Structures are given as structure tokens and as C-alpha cells.
A and B are shown apart, each in its own frame.
Chain A
């Protein structure tokens, strides 16, 4: 049941490797139900990691 969150982590890792911004933003805006279904700490740290990876490369200063 947690394999879905593993897949979310894997997709985020590939998005960070490629340099995608819109796809990562959509994934972050989509995974919210899965965030509000698991351990608060684990979901929070996943959110933090995804946000940091998104803000790393693509410098959309008007959107970040």
C-alpha cells in the first residue's frame, strides 16, 4: 500500500534528474490525498523533499 508513495518518490527523483518543473508541480498538487492518508511526519518530509527538489533547478522566481 506504501508502494504508491515509493512510486511518487521515484517519479520525483526522475523529474529532478531531468529538470522538470510543470510535471513536478502537478504531481505535488495531485499527491495531496496520499499525503493526508499516512504518517504525518513521513508525509511532511516527503512534501519537504519534493518542494526542495522542485525549487533546486528551475528558477521560476515568479512561481516558486
Chain B
């Protein structure tokens, strides 16, 4: 690159955007996450590195609630990730105010993705350094789960992972047999997969933030009850 990798508005001689090619690297470097579409819902999961015990209980959580039924599990540069989560919340609120009801997940992912692409198109602004899964469930449309990379577009995922170790996670995700497994056993298995992924082999202790959405929660994307999913974390430990 050298000369052409300075502003996203400058195309590469081969025709590539090296600003986004580098913004993907921050997501590749940051800690991982995972999301599996269970049979009747979507279960998230993300290990959070407690960089220092000075911090309180899990804060700056990689999970966020963008709307009543929609959840966002993000990885990468966390500040811009939070700003993007706010963009998503605003988008969902605006859609609910205009067209009523709840925002369909495919359209929400498409709109936030177009917004992200707007931030990589120009020169004055820089591409977002984050990649995130949006997961939602409803009775009408089942469970949907779309992953947005720092510059790319939403894609339908039965199961997806992002962050430090994408391939290591995806191997065991594809080993797991989704589409017939309930969100309970899926909540166990996602913790299992995160713990299979390295947590302390080169790093500190990790916190297991897990999220739910599904008919077992009648929509209403909420963080799984951590007190009762500590046993799921234990089963992962074994």
C-alpha cells in the first residue's frame, strides 16, 4: 500500500480500500464473540477480557440492546462500537415511530449496514472499527441473525463468530448441529465453545456475557439470567 492506504476515498491500484482492509484488522485483534441461531431463537455469547480486577462487575459489556426484541453483540473498537449501537437504537426507534410495530431484523441490519458503508465511502470520516451480530426473534419471522463487518454488508447466519479467533470458533460452531437444538442447550454450547477458545492461555481471566432471544422469552431480547447460567458456564468448564 504505502501511498494508497491513507484515506478511504483513495482506491488501490488493484482496486481495493486499504482503510477498510486495515479496519478489519482491529476486529481481528479484539476479543472474540459468537452467536448461534437455536431452533426457536438466537443465543449470543462473548468473552470479555477483564484487563484489571479494579473494574467492577462486567461493564462495557460487548452485548447491547438496540431494541425491544433485537440485540447486538459487538467486537472491535468498543467506543465506536457503542456509538454504532446508539445509531442502531435510534434507527429502531425511528422505524417504530414511523411504520409502527417492530423493526424487522433484515431491514434493521440492512439500514445500519448502509449507514456503516456511508462511513467508509468518504474521506473525511473513517470506517468503523467494529463488527457485530444483530440477533432477534419473533413468532412471525422466526429467529434471524445478521453479522455486519466493519465495512461489508449483513449476511444471514445460522451461526457466526467474530473477533480474535473466528476460524477456531467457526470450526466447532459448524461441528455443532443447530436448527433442531433448543436455546437452552445452545446457551450451554456457546459457553462451551467460548471456553474451548483460548481465554487465559495467553490472556487474563474472561467473563461470559450471554444473551437470549426467542419464544422462550416471547421475543424481548434480554441478557440470560447469569445466576442460573453460572451452571451452564460450569458445564462449559467441564
A contacting B, Cβ–Cβ less than 8 Å:
no
